[PDB]
Ligand binder design. Sequence first.
Ligand SMILES: OC[C@H]1O[C@@H](O)[C@H](O)[C@@H](O)[C@H]1O
Ligand code: NA
Length: 601
Amino acid sequence: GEPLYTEQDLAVNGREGFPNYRIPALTVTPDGDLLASYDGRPTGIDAPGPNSILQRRSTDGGRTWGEQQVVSAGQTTAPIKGFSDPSYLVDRETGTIFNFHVYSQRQGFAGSRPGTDPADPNVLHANVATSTDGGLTWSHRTITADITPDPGWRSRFAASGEGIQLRYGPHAGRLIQQYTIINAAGAFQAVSVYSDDHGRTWRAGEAVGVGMDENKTVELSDGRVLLNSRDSARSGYRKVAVSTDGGHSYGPVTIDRDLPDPTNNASIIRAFPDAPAGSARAKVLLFSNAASQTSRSQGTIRMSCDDGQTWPVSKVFQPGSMSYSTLTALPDGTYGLLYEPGTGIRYANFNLAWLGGICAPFTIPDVALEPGQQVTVPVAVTNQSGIAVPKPSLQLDASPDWQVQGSVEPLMPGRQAKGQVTITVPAGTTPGRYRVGATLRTSAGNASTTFTVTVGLLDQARMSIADVDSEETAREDGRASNVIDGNPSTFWHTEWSRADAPGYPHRISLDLGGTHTISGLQYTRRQNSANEQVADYEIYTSLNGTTWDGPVASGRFTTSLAPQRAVFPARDARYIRLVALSEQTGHKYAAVAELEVEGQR
Ligand SMILES: OC[C@H]1O[C@@H](O)[C@H](O)[C@@H](O)[C@H]1O
Ligand code: NA
């Protein structure tokens, strides 16, 4: 009906007893009470810090909130004890509420030492506060032994937010709470901690991935359990994995490109928790995170209607600073959101009318053209339920002096619609990769996508490596071939340490895959490291591949994270070579994220 979005702060840094309030966790008790838990940081730091687990309660749907009570109190005086990162799990069958959190003594997550002994002050323990009276009183347990099946698991912490109780299949009733472990090999993995006896005993299942962190799980419409992870390896995205069992294991982990993330926590819940298996309502997910890849800001709620395959809906709830966010389905049909705005922890409530709308994900392919060209590309839209939409619009978002227009036929229930986009780009358009936003406007809600229009660059898929002076391939993936894959997150790296290899006259040559008239080369520095940045370069070209002619260009490029051009009077060439002569701060390695060649296909 009428759109709703209201907010209020539950904790304000400096007020009510603590200098710092962080890490939100939201839930709704069986009686309909809302419970909000967060850390109270007297020192403004996580574990080993003397943090406390607090709690505020709302008995009127989230409008008014009670006083801040303590769930797990940390000791500031020696010996120092702390409680951090809460995560709620409500057993809807029995009514018990679990608040999972970290119990620290001397070490935190990165410094915890092997062991399961509650007494050992050097391991980071996994605790659980249990309540059978709605959250009023709690009973504490240290469950580290129960969940550390492999002695190599030297550290752990429960991903804050809220866990889940399975409703479908043979493992229906099972409580699952996600964790992050540090194995023997030093790797950060994800593991599900579950209980089949309503929480009396907790076992850990099989660990997943490498470079994982705070992860989240949801039950799909068919009973499958999807996992959505923060990526410690910082690719600017969420890692996802899925499971089909009850001794818990997930298949391969992959990066989801529809979900940008600045390596931060995020929520993913079932929009209709009590829907039947297989139904449309059972397929609707809500995900909240910070959409920025360089900052913890641009907090946005996204919506899926096909179990997480597509994410057509999105809307920003906090354009400004936004870090951790947690979601919860309220019994009135709305959704509760607890997040970090930089001032502490704030509570928000919104309904689906406020999101925009329409479950009509659409695809528009990636286009390559020469400046001064026009191209028309097809649009394919997949439609949802009570949606017979006779007049939908297509609003494209591009560079102002580019003419972009689009149209789509009507949307009929359960059918696919067709359409097209015409892009005309001017002759003086600088070669590059262009992101074009697409918005399917309809009187029943929003639906958006993005495609890429590449102007004036050759096709990398036709490119290969002719030669390279050195590639790091033992300790990491520093392959010369990572420059031609269209991903700034992967890089070529010169054979680095743990093998005292060559120094600076470094070089990489590309086989363009046929003769082309080229006038330039663009290069992108390695993004998350500053010590292998190329300074002085020289470009050489060739048609036979053995006799090289140049330097066709020379220069010193900057420390810019975006692509940098190296232009030269057009010429025919089958091969292009970049000779790196020095590094920005005199270091010995070279790493290039991407190499783009400007020319005519
Ligand atoms: O020795 C190579 C490595 O050195 C590290 O100090 C650096 O942070 C890494 O990005 C990698 O370059
Ligand atoms: Na790359």
